Write a protein that binds this ligand. Structure first.
Ligand SMILES: C[C@H](CCC(=O)O)[C@H]1CC[C@H]2[C@@H]3[C@H](O)C[C@@H]4C[C@H](O)CC[C@]4(C)[C@H]3C[C@H](O)[C@]12C
Ligand SMILES: C[C@H](CCC(=O)O)[C@H]1CC[C@H]2[C@@H]3[C@H](O)C[C@@H]4C[C@H](O)CC[C@]4(C)[C@H]3C[C@H](O)[C@]12C
Ligand SMILES: C[C@H](CCC(=O)O)[C@H]1CC[C@H]2[C@@H]3[C@H](O)C[C@@H]4C[C@H](O)CC[C@]4(C)[C@H]3C[C@H](O)[C@]12C
Ligand SMILES: C[C@H](CCC(=O)O)[C@H]1CC[C@H]2[C@@H]3[C@H](O)C[C@@H]4C[C@H](O)CC[C@]4(C)[C@H]3C[C@H](O)[C@]12C
Ligand SMILES: C[C@H](CCC(=O)O)[C@H]1CC[C@H]2[C@@H]3[C@H](O)C[C@@H]4C[C@H](O)CC[C@]4(C)[C@H]3C[C@H](O)[C@]12C
Length: 132
Protein backbone atom coordinates (compact mmCIF):
# COMPACT_ATOMS: atom_id res chain seq x y z
CA UNK A 1 0.00 0.00 0.00
CA UNK A 2 1.07 3.56 -0.84
CA UNK A 3 -2.28 5.42 -1.31
CA UNK A 4 -1.94 7.59 1.84
CA UNK A 5 1.74 8.55 1.38
CA UNK A 6 2.74 12.23 1.16
CA UNK A 7 1.85 15.68 2.45
CA UNK A 8 -1.79 16.83 2.79
CA UNK A 9 -3.46 20.16 3.67
CA UNK A 10 -6.96 20.89 5.01
CA UNK A 11 -9.28 22.50 2.45
CA UNK A 12 -12.72 21.95 4.05
CA UNK A 13 -14.42 21.01 7.33
CA UNK A 14 -18.10 20.09 7.27
CA UNK A 15 -19.96 19.59 10.57
CA UNK A 16 -17.14 21.34 12.45
CA UNK A 17 -19.34 23.45 14.79
CA UNK A 18 -21.81 20.73 15.94
CA UNK A 19 -18.97 18.22 16.42
CA UNK A 20 -16.94 20.69 18.54
CA UNK A 21 -20.01 21.58 20.66
CA UNK A 22 -20.79 17.90 21.32
CA UNK A 23 -17.25 17.16 22.56
CA UNK A 24 -17.35 20.18 24.91
CA UNK A 25 -15.21 22.76 23.10
CA UNK A 26 -16.56 26.24 23.99
CA UNK A 27 -17.96 28.70 21.42
CA UNK A 28 -15.12 31.27 21.24
CA UNK A 29 -12.56 28.48 20.70
CA UNK A 30 -14.68 26.95 17.89
CA UNK A 31 -14.72 30.32 16.08
CA UNK A 32 -10.96 30.70 16.67
CA UNK A 33 -10.35 27.40 14.85
CA UNK A 34 -12.84 27.17 11.95
CA UNK A 35 -10.33 28.56 9.42
CA UNK A 36 -7.28 26.69 10.80
CA UNK A 37 -5.60 24.60 8.05
CA UNK A 38 -3.87 21.42 9.28
CA UNK A 39 -0.94 19.87 7.40
CA UNK A 40 -0.78 16.04 7.61
CA UNK A 41 2.35 14.04 6.66
CA UNK A 42 1.98 10.26 6.14
CA UNK A 43 4.53 7.48 5.62
CA UNK A 44 2.85 4.16 4.82
CA UNK A 45 4.83 0.92 4.59
CA UNK A 46 2.43 -2.01 4.16
CA UNK A 47 0.66 -2.25 7.52
CA UNK A 48 2.91 0.26 9.26
CA UNK A 49 1.87 3.93 9.28
CA UNK A 50 3.63 7.06 10.52
CA UNK A 51 1.10 9.89 10.79
CA UNK A 52 2.28 13.41 11.49
CA UNK A 53 0.15 16.49 12.11
CA UNK A 54 1.52 20.03 12.21
CA UNK A 55 -0.10 22.47 14.62
CA UNK A 56 0.47 26.16 15.49
CA UNK A 57 3.57 27.31 17.42
CA UNK A 58 5.81 24.45 16.14
CA UNK A 59 3.61 21.88 17.92
CA UNK A 60 3.67 18.45 16.27
CA UNK A 61 1.71 15.24 16.80
CA UNK A 62 3.13 11.98 15.45
CA UNK A 63 1.22 8.69 15.56
CA UNK A 64 2.79 5.33 14.76
CA UNK A 65 0.73 2.21 14.29
CA UNK A 66 0.44 -1.16 12.61
CA UNK A 67 -2.94 -2.22 11.26
CA UNK A 68 -4.63 -4.76 13.54
CA UNK A 69 -2.10 -4.56 16.35
CA UNK A 70 -2.41 -2.69 19.65
CA UNK A 71 -0.57 0.62 19.21
CA UNK A 72 0.33 3.70 21.27
CA UNK A 73 -1.92 6.65 20.33
CA UNK A 74 -1.03 10.32 20.89
CA UNK A 75 -3.23 13.39 21.02
CA UNK A 76 -2.83 17.25 20.51
CA UNK A 77 -3.74 17.76 24.15
CA UNK A 78 -0.63 15.73 24.98
CA UNK A 79 -2.58 12.67 26.12
CA UNK A 80 -1.71 9.02 25.52
CA UNK A 81 -3.71 5.82 25.13
CA UNK A 82 -3.72 2.45 23.33
CA UNK A 83 -5.93 1.53 20.39
CA UNK A 84 -6.37 -0.84 17.44
CA UNK A 85 -6.87 0.32 13.84
CA UNK A 86 -8.51 -1.82 11.10
CA UNK A 87 -8.11 -1.49 7.34
CA UNK A 88 -11.38 -2.22 5.59
CA UNK A 89 -12.14 -1.26 1.98
CA UNK A 90 -9.15 1.08 1.86
CA UNK A 91 -10.46 2.83 4.99
CA UNK A 92 -8.43 3.16 8.20
CA UNK A 93 -10.82 2.84 11.13
CA UNK A 94 -10.51 3.19 14.90
CA UNK A 95 -13.65 2.39 16.89
CA UNK A 96 -14.59 2.46 20.57
CA UNK A 97 -17.34 3.73 22.93
CA UNK A 98 -18.51 7.23 21.93
CA UNK A 99 -16.10 7.66 18.99
CA UNK A 100 -15.30 6.46 15.50
CA UNK A 101 -12.77 7.77 13.00
CA UNK A 102 -12.42 6.67 9.43
CA UNK A 103 -9.83 7.90 6.95
CA UNK A 104 -9.74 7.11 3.22
CA UNK A 105 -8.71 8.58 -0.12
CA UNK A 106 -11.78 9.60 -2.15
CA UNK A 107 -11.44 11.56 -5.38
CA UNK A 108 -7.67 11.81 -4.87
CA UNK A 109 -8.32 13.52 -1.52
CA UNK A 110 -7.70 12.64 2.15
CA UNK A 111 -11.14 12.31 3.80
CA UNK A 112 -11.32 12.09 7.60
CA UNK A 113 -14.79 11.28 9.00
CA UNK A 114 -15.17 11.48 12.79
CA UNK A 115 -18.27 10.43 14.70
CA UNK A 116 -18.63 11.26 18.41
CA UNK A 117 -21.57 10.42 20.71
CA UNK A 118 -22.91 12.38 23.70
CA UNK A 119 -26.04 13.32 25.67
CA UNK A 120 -26.98 15.75 22.89
CA UNK A 121 -26.81 12.79 20.47
CA UNK A 122 -24.25 12.14 17.74
CA UNK A 123 -22.25 14.55 15.54
CA UNK A 124 -20.25 13.92 12.34
CA UNK A 125 -17.26 15.97 11.13
CA UNK A 126 -15.88 15.44 7.61
CA UNK A 127 -12.44 16.92 7.07
CA UNK A 128 -11.10 16.97 3.50
CA UNK A 129 -7.42 17.53 2.66
CA UNK A 130 -5.76 18.14 -0.70
CA UNK A 131 -2.34 16.81 -1.68
CA UNK A 132 0.45 19.41 -1.45
C1 LIG B 1 -8.75 26.06 17.86
C2 LIG B 1 -7.33 25.53 17.59
C3 LIG B 1 -6.56 26.51 16.70
C4 LIG B 1 -5.83 27.55 17.53
C5 LIG B 1 -5.11 28.60 16.66
O1 LIG B 1 -5.37 28.61 15.44
O2 LIG B 1 -4.31 29.36 17.26
C6 LIG B 1 -7.30 24.11 16.96
C7 LIG B 1 -5.85 23.56 16.91
C8 LIG B 1 -5.98 22.06 17.22
C9 LIG B 1 -7.47 21.81 16.96
C10 LIG B 1 -8.04 20.45 17.42
C11 LIG B 1 -7.31 19.24 16.78
O3 LIG B 1 -7.21 19.34 15.33
C12 LIG B 1 -7.94 17.90 17.22
C13 LIG B 1 -9.49 17.86 17.01
C14 LIG B 1 -9.83 17.67 15.50
C15 LIG B 1 -11.35 17.54 15.32
O4 LIG B 1 -11.62 17.41 13.94
C16 LIG B 1 -12.03 18.82 15.84
C17 LIG B 1 -11.72 19.00 17.33
C18 LIG B 1 -10.22 19.06 17.67
C19 LIG B 1 -10.09 18.91 19.19
C20 LIG B 1 -9.58 20.41 17.19
C21 LIG B 1 -10.31 21.66 17.74
C22 LIG B 1 -9.62 22.99 17.36
O5 LIG B 1 -9.85 23.26 15.96
C23 LIG B 1 -8.11 22.99 17.69
C24 LIG B 1 -7.87 22.95 19.22
C1 LIG C 1 -8.49 10.58 19.20
C2 LIG C 1 -7.52 11.62 18.61
C3 LIG C 1 -8.13 13.00 18.73
C4 LIG C 1 -7.32 13.69 19.82
C5 LIG C 1 -6.88 15.06 19.36
O1 LIG C 1 -5.86 15.14 18.61
O2 LIG C 1 -7.59 15.98 19.78
C6 LIG C 1 -7.05 11.40 17.15
C7 LIG C 1 -5.96 12.44 16.71
C8 LIG C 1 -5.11 11.73 15.64
C9 LIG C 1 -5.92 10.45 15.38
C10 LIG C 1 -5.21 9.33 14.63
C11 LIG C 1 -4.71 9.79 13.24
O3 LIG C 1 -5.71 10.54 12.56
C12 LIG C 1 -4.21 8.63 12.33
C13 LIG C 1 -5.10 7.37 12.35
C14 LIG C 1 -6.29 7.55 11.36
C15 LIG C 1 -7.29 6.37 11.38
O4 LIG C 1 -8.48 6.73 10.68
C16 LIG C 1 -7.69 5.97 12.80
C17 LIG C 1 -6.46 5.72 13.68
C18 LIG C 1 -5.50 6.91 13.80
C19 LIG C 1 -4.25 6.44 14.57
C20 LIG C 1 -6.16 8.10 14.54
C21 LIG C 1 -6.78 7.69 15.92
C22 LIG C 1 -7.39 8.87 16.69
O5 LIG C 1 -8.59 9.30 16.05
C23 LIG C 1 -6.39 10.05 16.80
C24 LIG C 1 -5.23 9.67 17.77
C1 LIG D 1 -10.71 18.59 22.85
C2 LIG D 1 -9.20 18.66 23.12
C3 LIG D 1 -8.76 17.35 23.76
C4 LIG D 1 -8.25 16.38 22.73
C5 LIG D 1 -6.77 16.12 22.93
O1 LIG D 1 -6.41 15.64 24.03
O2 LIG D 1 -6.03 16.39 21.98
C6 LIG D 1 -8.71 19.75 24.10
C7 LIG D 1 -7.27 20.25 23.78
C8 LIG D 1 -7.13 21.54 24.62
C9 LIG D 1 -8.50 21.60 25.33
C10 LIG D 1 -8.91 22.95 25.94
C11 LIG D 1 -7.90 23.43 27.02
O3 LIG D 1 -7.67 22.41 28.01
C12 LIG D 1 -8.34 24.74 27.70
C13 LIG D 1 -9.82 24.73 28.17
C14 LIG D 1 -9.92 23.96 29.50
C15 LIG D 1 -11.36 23.96 30.04
O4 LIG D 1 -11.41 23.16 31.22
C16 LIG D 1 -12.31 23.38 29.00
C17 LIG D 1 -12.25 24.18 27.68
C18 LIG D 1 -10.83 24.26 27.07
C19 LIG D 1 -10.88 25.33 25.96
C20 LIG D 1 -10.36 22.89 26.50
C21 LIG D 1 -11.39 22.26 25.51
C22 LIG D 1 -10.89 20.92 24.93
O5 LIG D 1 -10.88 19.93 25.97
C23 LIG D 1 -9.49 21.07 24.28
C24 LIG D 1 -9.54 21.92 22.98
C1 LIG E 1 -7.58 29.12 21.08
C2 LIG E 1 -7.79 28.57 22.51
C3 LIG E 1 -8.14 29.69 23.52
C4 LIG E 1 -8.92 30.87 22.94
C5 LIG E 1 -8.26 32.19 23.35
O1 LIG E 1 -7.36 32.62 22.60
O2 LIG E 1 -8.66 32.73 24.41
C6 LIG E 1 -6.59 27.76 23.07
C7 LIG E 1 -6.88 27.30 24.52
C8 LIG E 1 -6.23 25.91 24.68
C9 LIG E 1 -5.30 25.86 23.47
C10 LIG E 1 -4.69 24.48 23.12
C11 LIG E 1 -3.88 23.87 24.29
O3 LIG E 1 -2.82 24.75 24.67
C12 LIG E 1 -3.27 22.50 23.93
C13 LIG E 1 -2.44 22.56 22.62
C14 LIG E 1 -1.07 23.22 22.93
C15 LIG E 1 -0.18 23.30 21.70
O4 LIG E 1 1.03 23.99 22.04
C16 LIG E 1 -0.91 24.06 20.59
C17 LIG E 1 -2.23 23.33 20.22
C18 LIG E 1 -3.21 23.19 21.40
C19 LIG E 1 -4.31 22.19 20.96
C20 LIG E 1 -3.84 24.57 21.81
C21 LIG E 1 -4.59 25.31 20.65
C22 LIG E 1 -5.28 26.62 21.11
O5 LIG E 1 -4.29 27.62 21.38
C23 LIG E 1 -6.18 26.43 22.35
C24 LIG E 1 -7.41 25.54 22.02
C1 LIG F 1 -7.48 9.06 26.79
C2 LIG F 1 -7.23 10.56 27.02
C3 LIG F 1 -6.65 10.80 28.45
C4 LIG F 1 -5.50 9.83 28.83
C5 LIG F 1 -4.37 10.44 29.70
O1 LIG F 1 -4.69 10.87 30.83
O2 LIG F 1 -3.21 10.44 29.21
C6 LIG F 1 -8.51 11.43 26.71
C7 LIG F 1 -8.24 12.94 26.95
C8 LIG F 1 -8.91 13.69 25.78
C9 LIG F 1 -9.97 12.66 25.36
C10 LIG F 1 -10.79 12.98 24.08
C11 LIG F 1 -11.65 14.26 24.21
O3 LIG F 1 -12.54 14.20 25.34
C12 LIG F 1 -12.46 14.54 22.92
C13 LIG F 1 -13.30 13.32 22.44
C14 LIG F 1 -14.60 13.25 23.29
C15 LIG F 1 -15.50 12.09 22.86
O4 LIG F 1 -16.60 12.04 23.75
C16 LIG F 1 -14.73 10.77 22.97
C17 LIG F 1 -13.46 10.79 22.10
C18 LIG F 1 -12.49 11.98 22.35
C19 LIG F 1 -11.57 12.05 21.11
C20 LIG F 1 -11.68 11.75 23.67
C21 LIG F 1 -10.90 10.40 23.70
C22 LIG F 1 -10.14 10.21 25.02
O5 LIG F 1 -11.10 10.09 26.09
C23 LIG F 1 -9.14 11.37 25.27
C24 LIG F 1 -8.06 11.41 24.16
Amino acid sequence: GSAFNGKWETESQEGYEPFCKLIGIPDDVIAKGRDFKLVTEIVQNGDDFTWTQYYPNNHVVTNKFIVGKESDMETVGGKKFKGIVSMEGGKLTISFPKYQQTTEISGGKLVETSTASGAQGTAVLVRTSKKV
